Structure 1
């Protein structure tokens, strides 16, 4: 089956846990429960290539900044996440997450992921966003952040609707074998 280790990092509340849980259980958690750390599994095929996918959920809170890197040894592929409806989390990719990730794992493929794709064109979100003189992140914007960090790929998706979810994991694995 070939073990593949995958770690998911990114800002508080960008929807890392939902991504993992919705993909692994096709059920969307309504929770909301801040994460310390957590482990998950999937056995998948890909591309004819049976795999065993270890999934590591990390904490977004900086308080757990000492914990987080404990997950990084042996990692094969990273998912750096930001919410398409939260330019703070997008900026933090270049500020914190990609530097931290590269500090520890200089060589492992990264996969930039824009989350909450379903709120991108949401009336009620663009309203509150634009009340902070802000704007949802756009496909070309995400694409450009990918370039700066030389991520193997940029992918947008919604865990709640599942648009593009399978695809995030199916190129996370392809980035490995």
Structure 2
């Protein structure tokens, strides 16, 4: 039962903890609440491998400046959660990558690209754009709706896979 450090990254309004609450107790909150530091643990069987998920929710606001390259190193897998509602959240992911790369001390890294708010008719960015960008970094793109839990399960298992494939 291995514990993988899973940390989510994104902006305010995307719903990073939405995926976690949907997995822990399986509940979706309507009233968006800005989270600062929350830890979620649950025993899940990954492809037959019973593991313990040690997920940590990070702040979506750029408050921490000279304090990010501290706990960001302990993070194993990062969840690039963006929203198709606003392209701003899409470009925000880029900054996180640049930061993560310096913290990982390597060019390559096992990560996944997930597009939230896929169930909303407010599509500012298209699938091809996300797929195109994902192909450059060699990361898989999965559509994820936190409103009805669409693609969340798939994305979760795919992420853990990338981590295990990276080592084994």
TM-score range, shorter chain: 0.7 to 0.9
TM-score scaled by structure 1? 0.83
Q: Which structure 2 residue ranges, 5 or more long, are not aligned?
A: none
Name the Cα RMSD after superposition: 1.7
Distance 2:48 2:59 in 1: 34
1:37 aligns with 2:37: yes
Distance 1:168 1:24 in 2: 15
Aligned to 1:170: 157
Residues 159 and 174 of structure 1, relative CA distance in 2, 3 Å threshold = same
How many residue pairs match? The answer is 162
Q: State which drifts further: 101-110 or 164-173.
A: 101-110
Q: Map 1:49-64 onto structure 2 (within 5 A).
A: 49-64=49-64
Aligned to 2:126: 138
Q: Is the 8 A contact 1:22 1:29 kept in 2?
A: no
Aligned to 1:129: none
Aligned to 2:97: 98
Q: Which structure 1 residue ranges, 5 or more long, are not aligned?
A: 127-134
Deviations 1:32-67, CA, capped at 9 Å, x for gaps: 211212111121112121111111101110113444
